[PDB]
């Protein structure tokens, strides 16, 4: 173990010399070690998908081509599945969920945890610190705002933000060239 | 460090291999080598009770049974101790506080950290990204929603939200069979 | 792999049983091994800073002394540099941006990412999951309340909050000795 703690050490101090160097960047050790786009695959996400260490996946997701699943995640499917599209930037500290214990809590642990079903569409954006509780739709084209809470459906084109999250236009102006 | 480097990866991919198999998730590394029951019960957290790797614990932090740490979360009893109820649920994200350091970054370092001690009952929902401030003394069967900043005191069986947090109803329909 | 998984977690009782005992805290596996004090010297952040295992720091990001960077933090100078003043206190979740992908997703992939730099001053706080968006220059002796997000420039000795954040008064009083 004291060998081991001071191999652990040293390699942080070389991978973390390498990253600086390499990608210019310093990551946890954690994402030192995993690689995103393996993780990924492991995972049975699409080509392109990635994924950081410190991201949670819980049950049944599905993911397409092409998303960046940013850290500090949580992409929850344990209630009957969560889908996610194509092109989506999940950004840092975005947790996703088909479950919750608000009623198990409150009953002193006696009611079941509440389970429903939660999809997102292609070419979405979810700024940081968004939360999707479950049984929640959302389109293909959205823009979620960073810092929301989506209590309800949103259909495509749509640009949402605010807790909880309200339409504040289209979002046809994100996807121009 | 080549092939401890080589060894950790390989445990990475068989570790989660397992995990999905038999837990169906996938966690960060840390969490496939931390358990989650073993890690509460050696910070003296009552029976039940379980803790993310990626959770911080400062100073004095009492828990009670059966209740749930999320991940990405901060205890921080550090400033008089804080102290949870049983049955709780701690959101993913939620960082609850006994001091701050507004004074001594705003003073260019020279004034002290400011504490107060921190209280939570039993059979609680704190959700997603829930801050609650050094001081405050949450009472039994509350609910706090999602992206809530909660400042002041809050009674038995309320239901609160918002950034601050304001009284918005009872919590007495979630406590029902 | 069987071994190493078991010397892994030995490391962490023993590890945990010494951070009790001498700091009386409970971290996480890689804040256990990366040191914050040498974390920060490693990426050429000024003395007295110290950084969590758990941030990420991307590309050109400047810091001076004594600050401090907490977990769960996103440090983000991939788009044109980051600049940080001495003696900050930057808060858990917090995440710091010189880039977005907005259009890169809303156009299918098509689009490129979005940047500009960004600076804070010195004597500043950032309060929990913060959020300040590229481009934006904040002062001295800035207090940003938690659950913030910043989309426009804060001047020195303002107290802003909200999403997103508004001028609320000066920062003065919290200076004081």
Redesign the interface.
């Known amino acids: 173990?004291m060998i081991?703690?001071k191999?652990?050490?040293?390699?942080?101090?070389?991978?973390?010399?390498y990253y600086?160097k390499k990608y210019?960047?310093?990551?946890?050790?954690?994402?030192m070690?995993?690689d995103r786009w393996d993780?990924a695959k492991?995972?049975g996400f699409g080509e392109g998908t990635s994924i950081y260490?410190?991201?949670?996946?819980?049950?049944?997701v599905k993911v397409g081509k092409?998303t960046?699943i940013g850290?500090?995640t949580?992409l929850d499917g344990?209630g009957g599945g969560l889908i996610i599209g194509s092109?989506?930037?999940i950004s840092?500290?975005v947790?996703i969920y088909t479950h919750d214990?608000?009623?198990?809590?409150?009953?002193?642990?006696?009611?079941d945890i509440d389970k429903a079903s939660t999809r997102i569409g292609?070419?979405?954006?979810l700024?940081?610190?968004t939360?999707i509780?479950k049984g929640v739709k959302i389109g293909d084209?959205v823009?979620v705002?960073?810092?929301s809470?989506v209590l309800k459906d949103i259909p495509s084109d749509c640009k949402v933000?605010?807790?909880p999250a309200v339409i504040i236009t289209d979002?046809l102006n994100?996807?121009?060239?």
């Open positions: 173990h081991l703690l191999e652990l050490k040293e390699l942080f101090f070389l991978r973390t010399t600086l210019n960047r310093s990551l946890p050790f954690g994402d070690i995993v993780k492991l995972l260490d410190s991201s949670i996946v819980l049950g049944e092409d960046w850290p500090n949580i344990s092109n989506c930037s840092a500290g947790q214990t608000v009623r198990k809590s409150l009953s002193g642990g006696k009611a292609s070419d979405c954006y700024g940081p610190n939360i509780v084209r823009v705002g960073a810092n809470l933000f605010g807790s979002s994100y996807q121009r060239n």
